[PDB]
Structure 1
Protein backbone atom coordinates (compact mmCIF):
# COMPACT_ATOMS: atom_id res chain seq x y z
CA UNK A 1 0.00 0.00 0.00
CA UNK A 2 1.28 3.56 -0.60
CA UNK A 3 0.27 4.65 2.91
CA UNK A 4 1.94 1.70 4.65
CA UNK A 5 4.97 2.32 2.43
CA UNK A 6 5.23 5.83 3.91
CA UNK A 7 5.25 4.67 7.54
CA UNK A 8 7.67 1.94 6.46
CA UNK A 9 10.13 4.62 5.35
CA UNK A 10 9.57 6.68 8.51
CA UNK A 11 10.21 3.64 10.71
CA UNK A 12 13.50 2.79 8.99
CA UNK A 13 14.52 6.45 9.24
CA UNK A 14 13.89 6.18 12.98
CA UNK A 15 15.99 3.00 13.00
CA UNK A 16 18.82 4.80 11.20
CA UNK A 17 19.02 7.95 13.33
CA UNK A 18 18.62 5.87 16.50
CA UNK A 19 21.80 4.05 15.50
CA UNK A 20 23.58 7.38 15.05
CA UNK A 21 23.12 9.17 18.38
CA UNK A 22 23.31 5.83 20.21
CA UNK A 23 26.64 5.03 18.52
CA UNK A 24 28.21 8.39 19.38
CA UNK A 25 29.47 8.55 23.01
CA UNK A 26 27.83 10.49 25.85
CA UNK A 27 28.90 13.73 27.55
CA UNK A 28 31.06 14.79 24.60
CA UNK A 29 32.29 18.38 24.36
CA UNK A 30 33.56 20.69 21.63
CA UNK A 31 34.59 24.36 21.66
CA UNK A 32 33.03 26.16 18.68
CA UNK A 33 34.20 29.75 18.21
CA UNK A 34 31.90 32.48 16.91
CA UNK A 35 32.95 34.50 13.86
CA UNK A 36 31.21 37.50 12.34
CA UNK A 37 30.88 41.25 12.41
CA UNK A 38 28.43 40.93 15.33
CA UNK A 39 29.41 39.92 18.91
CA UNK A 40 32.80 38.33 18.12
CA UNK A 41 35.14 36.61 20.57
CA UNK A 42 32.55 34.23 22.00
CA UNK A 43 33.19 30.48 22.14
CA UNK A 44 30.51 27.93 23.04
CA UNK A 45 31.13 24.65 24.87
CA UNK A 46 28.69 22.42 22.97
CA UNK A 47 27.95 18.74 22.48
CA UNK A 48 29.07 16.73 19.46
CA UNK A 49 25.82 15.07 18.31
CA UNK A 50 22.86 16.58 20.24
CA UNK A 51 23.76 20.27 20.09
CA UNK A 52 22.94 22.31 16.98
CA UNK A 53 23.56 25.86 15.69
CA UNK A 54 19.94 26.72 16.52
CA UNK A 55 20.76 25.83 20.12
CA UNK A 56 23.92 27.94 19.85
CA UNK A 57 21.94 30.94 18.61
CA UNK A 58 19.42 30.46 21.43
CA UNK A 59 22.23 30.81 23.97
CA UNK A 60 23.17 34.08 22.25
CA UNK A 61 19.80 35.65 21.36
CA UNK A 62 16.47 34.58 19.88
CA UNK A 63 16.68 37.49 17.43
CA UNK A 64 19.23 35.42 15.52
CA UNK A 65 17.08 32.30 15.95
CA UNK A 66 14.27 34.08 14.11
CA UNK A 67 16.66 35.50 11.48
CA UNK A 68 19.16 32.63 11.04
CA UNK A 69 18.51 30.28 8.12
CA UNK A 70 21.97 28.69 7.75
CA UNK A 71 25.45 28.84 9.26
CA UNK A 72 28.98 28.70 7.86
CA UNK A 73 31.13 25.90 9.30
CA UNK A 74 34.75 26.49 8.23
CA UNK A 75 33.62 28.19 5.02
CA UNK A 76 30.66 26.09 3.84
CA UNK A 77 26.93 26.18 4.62
CA UNK A 78 25.23 24.19 7.34
CA UNK A 79 21.68 23.21 8.30
CA UNK A 80 20.44 24.84 11.50
CA UNK A 81 19.26 21.51 12.99
CA UNK A 82 22.24 19.37 11.90
CA UNK A 83 24.66 18.76 14.81
CA UNK A 84 28.20 20.03 14.42
CA UNK A 85 30.53 17.09 15.03
CA UNK A 86 33.78 18.88 15.94
CA UNK A 87 35.29 22.09 17.25
CA UNK A 88 35.28 24.68 14.46
CA UNK A 89 34.27 28.24 13.59
CA UNK A 90 30.61 29.21 13.16
CA UNK A 91 28.88 32.24 11.64
CA UNK A 92 25.14 32.67 11.15
CA UNK A 93 23.88 34.48 8.06
CA UNK A 94 20.48 35.85 7.02
CA UNK A 95 18.56 36.94 3.93
CA UNK A 96 19.83 40.55 4.15
CA UNK A 97 23.60 40.12 3.80
CA UNK A 98 26.32 40.97 1.29
CA UNK A 99 26.22 37.45 -0.22
CA UNK A 100 23.00 35.66 0.82
CA UNK A 101 23.05 33.55 -2.35
CA UNK A 102 23.69 30.31 -0.47
CA UNK A 103 20.67 31.09 1.72
CA UNK A 104 18.52 31.67 -1.36
CA UNK A 105 19.75 28.44 -2.96
CA UNK A 106 18.81 26.56 0.21
CA UNK A 107 15.39 28.23 0.06
CA UNK A 108 15.23 27.36 -3.64
CA UNK A 109 15.75 23.71 -2.67
CA UNK A 110 13.40 24.03 0.31
CA UNK A 111 10.48 25.53 -1.61
CA UNK A 112 11.25 22.98 -4.34
CA UNK A 113 11.16 20.16 -1.77
CA UNK A 114 7.70 20.29 -0.21
CA UNK A 115 6.07 21.18 -3.53
CA UNK A 116 6.74 17.55 -4.41
CA UNK A 117 5.36 16.52 -1.02
CA UNK A 118 1.91 18.08 -1.31
CA UNK A 119 1.30 17.09 -4.94
CA UNK A 120 2.09 13.37 -4.53
CA UNK A 121 0.25 13.23 -1.20
CA UNK A 122 -2.80 15.04 -2.60
CA UNK A 123 -3.51 12.18 -5.03
CA UNK A 124 -8.04 10.47 -6.92
CA UNK A 125 -6.12 8.10 -4.63
CA UNK A 126 -5.91 5.11 -6.99
CA UNK A 127 -3.34 6.92 -9.15
CA UNK A 128 0.37 6.37 -8.52
CA UNK A 129 3.41 8.65 -8.42
CA UNK A 130 7.01 7.93 -9.49
CA UNK A 131 8.64 11.29 -8.71
CA UNK A 132 12.25 11.82 -9.85
CA UNK A 133 13.95 14.76 -8.09
CA UNK A 134 13.86 18.49 -7.33
CA UNK A 135 15.98 19.99 -10.16
CA UNK A 136 18.47 22.67 -9.18
CA UNK A 137 17.92 26.06 -10.83
CA UNK A 138 19.64 29.44 -10.35
CA UNK A 139 18.19 32.47 -8.60
CA UNK A 140 17.45 34.14 -11.96
CA UNK A 141 15.06 31.33 -12.91
CA UNK A 142 12.25 33.26 -11.21
CA UNK A 143 10.45 30.09 -10.11
CA UNK A 144 11.11 26.77 -8.39
CA UNK A 145 10.44 23.61 -10.40
CA UNK A 146 9.98 19.93 -9.58
CA UNK A 147 9.97 17.16 -12.17
CA UNK A 148 7.57 14.21 -12.03
CA UNK A 149 6.29 11.36 -14.21
CA UNK A 150 2.79 9.88 -14.41
CA UNK A 151 -0.39 6.53 -15.12
CA UNK A 152 -0.65 6.63 -18.92
CA UNK A 153 -4.46 6.90 -18.85
CA UNK A 154 -4.22 10.55 -17.70
CA UNK A 155 -1.22 11.35 -19.91
CA UNK A 156 -3.16 13.78 -22.11
CA UNK A 157 -4.78 15.41 -19.07
CA UNK A 158 -3.09 18.30 -17.26
CA UNK A 159 -4.09 19.71 -13.85
CA UNK A 160 -6.73 22.43 -13.97
CA UNK A 161 -6.82 25.71 -12.05
CA UNK A 162 -8.98 24.23 -9.28
CA UNK A 163 -6.45 21.40 -9.00
CA UNK A 164 -3.69 24.00 -8.62
CA UNK A 165 -5.69 25.88 -5.98
CA UNK A 166 -6.18 22.61 -4.10
CA UNK A 167 -2.42 22.12 -3.77
CA UNK A 168 -1.92 25.73 -2.64
CA UNK A 169 -4.32 25.54 0.30
CA UNK A 170 -2.81 22.17 1.22
CA UNK A 171 0.68 23.69 1.15
CA UNK A 172 -0.70 26.58 3.20
CA UNK A 173 -1.88 23.99 5.73
CA UNK A 174 1.54 22.31 5.86
CA UNK A 175 3.34 25.56 6.72
CA UNK A 176 0.71 26.37 9.35
CA UNK A 177 1.71 23.23 11.26
CA UNK A 178 5.30 24.56 11.49
CA UNK A 179 7.09 21.42 10.35
CA UNK A 180 10.85 21.45 11.09
CA UNK A 181 13.29 19.97 8.59
CA UNK A 182 14.76 16.95 10.40
CA UNK A 183 17.98 16.02 8.60
CA UNK A 184 20.31 13.03 8.84
CA UNK A 185 23.55 11.70 7.36
CA UNK A 186 23.06 8.21 5.91
CA UNK A 187 24.90 5.65 3.81
CA UNK A 188 24.13 4.87 0.17
CA UNK A 189 23.29 1.27 1.13
CA UNK A 190 20.76 2.66 3.62
CA UNK A 191 19.17 5.28 1.37
CA UNK A 192 18.74 2.82 -1.50
CA UNK A 193 16.96 0.48 0.93
CA UNK A 194 14.48 3.27 1.75
CA UNK A 195 13.72 4.05 -1.92
CA UNK A 196 14.30 0.56 -3.34
CA UNK A 197 10.98 0.77 -5.21
CA UNK A 198 11.14 4.08 -7.11
CA UNK A 199 13.86 3.54 -9.72
CA UNK A 200 14.29 7.28 -10.28
CA UNK A 201 15.40 7.73 -6.66
CA UNK A 202 17.61 4.62 -6.90
CA UNK A 203 19.85 5.84 -9.72
CA UNK A 204 19.77 9.35 -8.23
CA UNK A 205 21.35 7.91 -5.07
CA UNK A 206 24.02 6.07 -7.08
CA UNK A 207 24.65 9.40 -8.83
CA UNK A 208 25.18 11.15 -5.49
CA UNK A 209 27.15 8.15 -4.21
CA UNK A 210 29.31 8.32 -7.34
CA UNK A 211 29.92 12.05 -6.85
CA UNK A 212 30.80 11.43 -3.19
CA UNK A 213 34.10 9.55 -2.61
CA UNK A 214 32.94 7.98 0.66
CA UNK A 215 29.39 7.47 -0.76
CA UNK A 216 27.81 9.04 2.35
CA UNK A 217 24.66 11.02 1.55
CA UNK A 218 22.61 13.46 3.60
CA UNK A 219 18.84 13.09 3.89
CA UNK A 220 15.99 15.40 4.91
CA UNK A 221 12.53 14.35 6.11
CA UNK A 222 9.32 16.33 5.72
CA UNK A 223 7.28 14.77 8.52
CA UNK A 224 6.08 11.54 6.95
CA UNK A 225 7.54 12.50 3.55
CA UNK A 226 11.25 12.06 2.81
CA UNK A 227 13.40 13.31 -0.07
CA UNK A 228 17.04 13.97 -0.96
CA UNK A 229 18.56 17.42 -1.46
CA UNK A 230 21.95 18.46 -2.81
CA UNK A 231 22.46 21.41 -0.45
CA UNK A 232 21.18 22.42 3.00
CA UNK A 233 17.66 23.68 3.60
CA UNK A 234 15.78 26.24 5.70
CA UNK A 235 15.12 25.38 9.38
CA UNK A 236 11.31 25.60 9.53
CA UNK A 237 8.42 25.49 7.06
CA UNK A 238 6.58 28.44 8.62
CA UNK A 239 9.14 31.03 7.48
CA UNK A 240 7.89 30.90 3.86
CA UNK A 241 5.03 33.39 3.98
CA UNK A 242 3.17 33.10 0.65
CA UNK A 243 3.60 29.96 -1.41
CA UNK A 244 1.73 28.69 -4.46
CA UNK A 245 2.11 26.75 -7.71
CA UNK A 246 2.20 28.82 -10.90
CA UNK A 247 1.52 26.45 -13.81
CA UNK A 248 2.27 23.01 -15.25
CA UNK A 249 4.02 21.90 -18.44
CA UNK A 250 5.00 18.62 -20.08
CA UNK A 251 10.24 16.99 -22.30
CA UNK A 252 9.91 15.70 -25.87
CA UNK A 253 10.63 12.05 -24.89
CA UNK A 254 7.10 11.72 -23.53
CA UNK A 255 6.12 8.14 -24.44
CA UNK A 256 9.24 6.32 -23.13
CA UNK A 257 9.04 8.37 -19.92
CA UNK A 258 6.70 11.33 -19.46
CA UNK A 259 8.45 14.42 -18.08
CA UNK A 260 5.94 16.50 -16.13
CA UNK A 261 7.33 19.39 -14.11
CA UNK A 262 5.36 21.82 -11.97
CA UNK A 263 6.44 25.38 -11.23
CA UNK A 264 5.79 27.87 -8.43
CA UNK A 265 7.02 30.99 -6.67
CA UNK A 266 7.33 32.01 -3.01
CA UNK A 267 9.39 34.09 -0.61
CA UNK A 268 10.10 34.29 3.16
CA UNK A 269 8.41 36.21 5.98
CA UNK A 270 11.43 38.48 6.54
CA UNK A 271 10.55 40.23 3.25
CA UNK A 272 6.85 39.95 2.44
CA UNK A 273 5.58 41.11 -0.95
CA UNK A 274 2.69 43.37 -1.91
CA UNK A 275 -0.31 42.27 -3.98
CA UNK A 276 0.80 44.17 -7.09
CA UNK A 277 4.46 43.11 -7.22
CA UNK A 278 3.35 39.61 -6.22
CA UNK A 279 0.93 39.48 -9.16
CA UNK A 280 3.53 40.21 -11.84
CA UNK A 281 5.70 37.47 -10.30
CA UNK A 282 2.89 34.94 -10.79
CA UNK A 283 2.65 35.36 -14.58
CA UNK A 284 6.46 35.26 -14.58
CA UNK A 285 6.38 31.84 -12.90
CA UNK A 286 3.47 30.63 -15.04
CA UNK A 287 5.85 30.65 -18.03
CA UNK A 288 8.23 27.81 -18.85
CA UNK A 289 11.79 27.40 -17.57
CA UNK A 290 14.41 26.79 -20.25
CA UNK A 291 17.25 25.48 -18.06
Structure 2
Protein backbone atom coordinates (compact mmCIF):
# COMPACT_ATOMS: atom_id res chain seq x y z
CA UNK A 1 0.00 0.00 0.00
CA UNK A 2 1.12 3.61 -0.55
CA UNK A 3 0.62 4.48 3.14
CA UNK A 4 3.26 2.02 4.39
CA UNK A 5 5.84 2.36 1.60
CA UNK A 6 6.34 6.08 2.24
CA UNK A 7 6.56 5.48 5.99
CA UNK A 8 9.20 2.78 5.55
CA UNK A 9 11.14 5.01 3.14
CA UNK A 10 11.09 7.87 5.65
CA UNK A 11 12.22 5.51 8.41
CA UNK A 12 15.10 4.26 6.25
CA UNK A 13 16.09 7.84 5.41
CA UNK A 14 16.08 8.76 9.11
CA UNK A 15 18.18 5.69 9.91
CA UNK A 16 20.67 6.63 7.18
CA UNK A 17 20.85 10.19 8.52
CA UNK A 18 21.49 8.88 12.04
CA UNK A 19 24.20 6.53 10.76
CA UNK A 20 25.88 9.35 8.82
CA UNK A 21 25.75 11.64 11.86
CA UNK A 22 27.01 8.99 14.33
CA UNK A 23 30.50 8.90 12.74
CA UNK A 24 31.88 12.42 13.16
CA UNK A 25 34.35 12.75 16.11
CA UNK A 26 32.04 15.09 18.03
CA UNK A 27 32.39 18.30 16.00
CA UNK A 28 35.43 18.38 13.68
CA UNK A 29 36.36 22.00 13.00
CA UNK A 30 37.46 22.88 9.47
CA UNK A 31 38.08 25.98 7.35
CA UNK A 32 36.48 26.94 4.03
CA UNK A 33 37.43 29.94 1.89
CA UNK A 34 35.05 32.10 -0.15
CA UNK A 35 36.83 32.85 -3.43
CA UNK A 36 34.18 34.83 -5.31
CA UNK A 37 33.74 37.96 -7.38
CA UNK A 38 31.86 39.70 -4.54
CA UNK A 39 33.39 40.46 -1.14
CA UNK A 40 36.96 39.15 -1.61
CA UNK A 41 37.32 37.41 0.67
CA UNK A 42 36.23 36.09 4.05
CA UNK A 43 36.98 32.64 5.46
CA UNK A 44 34.47 30.59 7.47
CA UNK A 45 35.44 28.21 10.28
CA UNK A 46 32.39 25.96 9.94
CA UNK A 47 32.04 22.20 10.51
CA UNK A 48 32.21 19.28 8.07
CA UNK A 49 29.22 17.05 8.95
CA UNK A 50 26.68 19.49 10.44
CA UNK A 51 27.29 22.93 8.95
CA UNK A 52 26.09 23.83 5.46
CA UNK A 53 26.72 26.65 2.96
CA UNK A 54 23.47 28.10 4.30
CA UNK A 55 25.36 28.84 7.52
CA UNK A 56 28.00 30.74 5.53
CA UNK A 57 25.27 32.69 3.73
CA UNK A 58 23.64 33.58 7.05
CA UNK A 59 27.01 34.69 8.42
CA UNK A 60 27.49 36.89 5.34
CA UNK A 61 24.08 38.52 4.87
CA UNK A 62 20.43 37.65 4.36
CA UNK A 63 20.73 38.72 0.71
CA UNK A 64 23.06 35.77 0.08
CA UNK A 65 20.56 33.31 1.57
CA UNK A 66 17.77 34.91 -0.47
CA UNK A 67 19.75 34.76 -3.74
CA UNK A 68 22.19 31.86 -3.34
CA UNK A 69 20.97 28.59 -4.85
CA UNK A 70 24.10 26.49 -5.47
CA UNK A 71 27.74 26.54 -4.39
CA UNK A 72 30.65 25.41 -6.57
CA UNK A 73 32.90 23.25 -4.37
CA UNK A 74 36.15 22.93 -6.34
CA UNK A 75 34.16 23.28 -9.56
CA UNK A 76 31.32 20.95 -8.53
CA UNK A 77 28.00 22.58 -7.56
CA UNK A 78 26.51 21.74 -4.17
CA UNK A 79 23.15 22.31 -2.52
CA UNK A 80 22.46 24.87 0.20
CA UNK A 81 21.66 22.08 2.70
CA UNK A 82 24.63 19.72 2.40
CA UNK A 83 27.64 19.02 4.66
CA UNK A 84 30.84 20.62 3.34
CA UNK A 85 33.30 17.73 3.38
CA UNK A 86 36.97 18.59 3.87
CA UNK A 87 38.36 22.11 3.37
CA UNK A 88 37.52 23.52 -0.07
CA UNK A 89 36.11 26.68 -1.67
CA UNK A 90 32.60 28.09 -2.09
CA UNK A 91 31.14 30.24 -4.88
CA UNK A 92 27.56 31.40 -4.33
CA UNK A 93 25.56 31.46 -7.56
CA UNK A 94 22.24 33.09 -8.46
CA UNK A 95 19.83 33.29 -11.40
CA UNK A 96 21.42 36.43 -12.90
CA UNK A 97 24.98 35.24 -13.54
CA UNK A 98 27.28 34.82 -16.53
CA UNK A 99 26.85 31.04 -16.92
CA UNK A 100 23.96 29.85 -14.72
CA UNK A 101 23.83 26.45 -16.41
CA UNK A 102 24.28 24.47 -13.19
CA UNK A 103 21.53 26.47 -11.46
CA UNK A 104 19.26 25.93 -14.47
CA UNK A 105 19.87 22.17 -14.40
CA UNK A 106 19.24 22.08 -10.64
CA UNK A 107 15.96 23.96 -11.10
CA UNK A 108 14.98 21.57 -13.90
CA UNK A 109 15.65 18.54 -11.71
CA UNK A 110 13.76 20.12 -8.81
CA UNK A 111 10.74 20.84 -11.02
CA UNK A 112 10.83 17.27 -12.35
CA UNK A 113 10.96 15.84 -8.82
CA UNK A 114 8.12 18.10 -7.68
CA UNK A 115 5.95 17.08 -10.64
CA UNK A 116 6.69 13.42 -9.93
CA UNK A 117 5.76 13.84 -6.27
CA UNK A 118 2.53 15.63 -7.23
CA UNK A 119 1.66 12.83 -9.66
CA UNK A 120 2.36 10.19 -7.01
CA UNK A 121 0.26 12.00 -4.39
CA UNK A 122 -2.63 12.70 -6.79
CA UNK A 123 -3.73 9.13 -7.53
CA UNK A 124 4.26 4.25 -10.62
CA UNK A 125 7.22 6.38 -11.70
CA UNK A 126 10.23 5.29 -13.76
CA UNK A 127 12.85 8.05 -13.60
CA UNK A 128 13.61 11.73 -14.30
CA UNK A 129 14.72 12.36 -17.91
CA UNK A 130 17.55 14.89 -18.22
CA UNK A 131 15.89 17.26 -20.68
CA UNK A 132 18.04 20.27 -21.67
CA UNK A 133 16.89 23.82 -20.99
CA UNK A 134 16.47 24.64 -24.69
CA UNK A 135 13.50 22.25 -24.85
CA UNK A 136 11.67 24.40 -22.30
CA UNK A 137 9.56 21.54 -20.96
CA UNK A 138 10.78 19.28 -18.16
CA UNK A 139 9.29 15.79 -18.54
CA UNK A 140 8.66 12.95 -16.10
CA UNK A 141 7.57 9.60 -17.53
CA UNK A 142 4.99 7.63 -15.54
CA UNK A 143 3.88 4.00 -15.78
CA UNK A 144 0.18 3.67 -14.96
CA UNK A 145 -6.85 9.79 -20.02
CA UNK A 146 -6.68 13.09 -18.10
CA UNK A 147 -8.51 16.28 -19.02
CA UNK A 148 -8.25 20.01 -18.33
CA UNK A 149 -9.80 19.45 -14.89
CA UNK A 150 -7.05 16.96 -14.06
CA UNK A 151 -4.39 19.48 -15.09
CA UNK A 152 -6.06 22.17 -12.99
CA UNK A 153 -6.15 19.86 -9.96
CA UNK A 154 -2.49 18.96 -10.49
CA UNK A 155 -1.53 22.64 -10.67
CA UNK A 156 -3.53 23.35 -7.51
CA UNK A 157 -1.77 20.50 -5.70
CA UNK A 158 1.61 21.80 -6.87
CA UNK A 159 0.77 25.31 -5.66
CA UNK A 160 -0.32 23.90 -2.29
CA UNK A 161 2.91 21.90 -1.98
CA UNK A 162 4.89 25.05 -2.82
CA UNK A 163 3.01 27.09 -0.22
CA UNK A 164 3.69 24.34 2.33
CA UNK A 165 7.38 25.32 2.14
CA UNK A 166 9.43 22.14 2.61
CA UNK A 167 13.24 22.00 2.34
CA UNK A 168 15.14 19.51 0.20
CA UNK A 169 16.88 16.96 2.45
CA UNK A 170 19.85 15.56 0.52
CA UNK A 171 22.29 12.79 1.41
CA UNK A 172 25.18 10.73 0.03
CA UNK A 173 23.86 7.19 0.46
CA UNK A 174 25.54 4.10 -0.97
CA UNK A 175 23.98 1.67 -3.45
CA UNK A 176 22.97 -1.12 -1.06
CA UNK A 177 20.72 1.10 1.07
CA UNK A 178 19.46 2.89 -2.05
CA UNK A 179 18.34 -0.43 -3.53
CA UNK A 180 16.87 -1.60 -0.21
CA UNK A 181 14.79 1.58 -0.08
CA UNK A 182 13.35 1.38 -3.61
CA UNK A 183 13.11 -2.42 -3.66
CA UNK A 184 9.42 -2.40 -4.64
CA UNK A 185 10.20 -0.74 -8.00
CA UNK A 186 12.31 -2.40 -10.70
CA UNK A 187 12.76 0.76 -12.79
CA UNK A 188 14.26 2.68 -9.86
CA UNK A 189 16.46 -0.33 -9.07
CA UNK A 190 17.80 -0.36 -12.63
CA UNK A 191 18.33 3.41 -12.52
CA UNK A 192 20.28 3.15 -9.25
CA UNK A 193 22.37 0.31 -10.67
CA UNK A 194 23.17 2.35 -13.78
CA UNK A 195 24.07 5.40 -11.69
CA UNK A 196 26.36 3.30 -9.49
CA UNK A 197 28.03 1.66 -12.50
CA UNK A 198 28.56 5.04 -14.19
CA UNK A 199 30.71 6.43 -11.37
CA UNK A 200 33.85 4.69 -10.05
CA UNK A 201 32.46 3.89 -6.60
CA UNK A 202 28.82 3.35 -5.60
CA UNK A 203 27.75 6.62 -3.93
CA UNK A 204 24.06 6.85 -4.89
CA UNK A 205 22.86 10.39 -4.20
CA UNK A 206 19.36 10.46 -2.70
CA UNK A 207 17.04 13.32 -1.81
CA UNK A 208 13.86 13.75 0.23
CA UNK A 209 11.11 16.37 0.13
CA UNK A 210 9.49 16.04 3.55
CA UNK A 211 7.73 12.76 2.80
CA UNK A 212 8.72 11.80 -0.77
CA UNK A 213 12.06 10.29 -1.82
CA UNK A 214 13.40 10.15 -5.38
CA UNK A 215 16.69 9.84 -7.27
CA UNK A 216 18.45 12.59 -9.21
CA UNK A 217 21.85 13.38 -10.78
CA UNK A 218 22.97 16.90 -9.85
CA UNK A 219 22.03 19.45 -7.18
CA UNK A 220 18.46 20.61 -6.51
CA UNK A 221 16.52 23.63 -5.27
CA UNK A 222 16.84 24.23 -1.49
CA UNK A 223 13.35 25.42 -0.55
CA UNK A 224 10.17 24.99 -2.60
CA UNK A 225 9.20 28.63 -1.95
CA UNK A 226 11.57 29.70 -4.74
CA UNK A 227 9.25 28.13 -7.35
CA UNK A 228 6.77 31.00 -7.57
CA UNK A 229 4.92 30.07 -10.76
CA UNK A 230 4.04 26.48 -11.63
CA UNK A 231 1.75 24.89 -14.21
CA UNK A 232 1.19 21.65 -16.13
CA UNK A 233 0.90 21.89 -19.91
CA UNK A 234 -0.34 18.48 -21.10
CA UNK A 235 0.36 14.75 -20.88
CA UNK A 236 2.06 12.83 -23.69
CA UNK A 237 2.70 9.14 -24.36
CA UNK A 238 4.61 4.89 -20.52
CA UNK A 239 2.80 8.22 -20.13
CA UNK A 240 4.90 11.39 -20.21
CA UNK A 241 3.89 14.47 -18.21
CA UNK A 242 4.98 17.94 -19.32
CA UNK A 243 5.00 21.25 -17.49
CA UNK A 244 6.70 24.60 -17.07
CA UNK A 245 7.54 26.63 -13.97
CA UNK A 246 9.33 29.88 -13.17
CA UNK A 247 10.99 30.84 -9.87
CA UNK A 248 11.21 34.19 -8.07
CA UNK A 249 12.94 37.11 -9.81
CA UNK A 250 11.82 35.74 -13.20
CA UNK A 251 8.12 36.60 -13.47
CA UNK A 252 6.49 36.20 -16.88
CA UNK A 253 3.67 38.66 -16.08
CA UNK A 254 0.98 36.72 -17.97
CA UNK A 255 1.39 36.98 -21.75
CA UNK A 256 4.85 35.38 -21.72
CA UNK A 257 3.48 32.78 -19.29
CA UNK A 258 0.69 31.82 -21.69
CA UNK A 259 3.13 31.80 -24.61
CA UNK A 260 5.47 29.43 -22.77
CA UNK A 261 2.52 27.23 -21.79
CA UNK A 262 1.40 27.02 -25.43
CA UNK A 263 4.97 26.25 -26.53
CA UNK A 264 5.31 23.46 -23.95
CA UNK A 265 1.88 22.03 -24.85
CA UNK A 266 3.40 20.78 -28.11
**TM-score bucket (shorter structure):** over 0.9
How far apart are residue 33 of structure 1 and its match? 0.4
**Cα distance in 2 between the residues matched to 1:212 and 1:188:** 11
Structure with greater strand percent: 1
Q: 1:192-221 CA deviation, whole Å, 9 max, x = no partner?
A: 000001100000000001012111111110
**Does the residue aligned with 1:23 lie in a helix, a strand or coil?**
coil
Secondary structure of 1:200's counterpart equals helix
1:221 aligns with 2:208: yes
CA displacement 1:121-160 (0-9 Å, x = unmatched): 111xxxxxx21011001110111110111xxxxxxxx211
**Count of residue pairs brought into register by the alignment:** 265
Q: Deviations 1:94-145 (Å, cap 9, x if unpaired)? A: 000000011001001000111000111111xxxxxx2101100111011111
Separation (CA, whole Å) in 2 of partners of 1:81 and 1:41: 22
TM-score, L = length of structure 1: 0.90
SS at match of 2:98: coil
Structure 1 residue 41, shift from structure 2 partner: 2.1
TM-score (norm 2): 0.98
Q: Take 2:54 and 2:249, find their aligned partners in 1: how far apart are those partners?
A: 18
Deviation string for 1:46-102 (max 9, x for gaps)?
Answer: 101000001111000010100001001011111110110111111101000000011
Larger Rg computed on CA atoms: 1
Question: Residue 272 of structure 1: CA displacement?
Answer: 1.2
Return the offset for 1:37: 1.0
Distance 1:105 1:210 in 2: 22
What is the deviation of 1:27?
A: 2.0
Which of 137, 140, 148 aligns to 1:146? It is: 140
1:238 is paired with a residue of what secondary structure?
A: helix
Q: 1: distance between equivalents of 2:125 and 2:210?
A: 18
3-state secondary structure, aligned to 1:140: coil
Deviations, residues 229-279 of structure 1 (Å, cap 9, x unaligned): 1010011101011101100111xxxxxxxx111000011112111111111
**Structure 1 unpaired stretches of 5+:** 124-129, 150-157, 251-258
Runs of 4 or more, structure 1, over 6 Å off, are none
Note the C-alpha offset of 1:4.
1.0
Q: Aligned to 2:10, what secondary structure does the other structure show?
A: helix
Alignment of structure 1 residues 115-264 onto 2, 5 Å: 115-123=115-123, 130-149=124-143, 158-250=145-237, 259-264=238-243
**Mapped partners of 1:75, 1:22: distance in 2:** 29
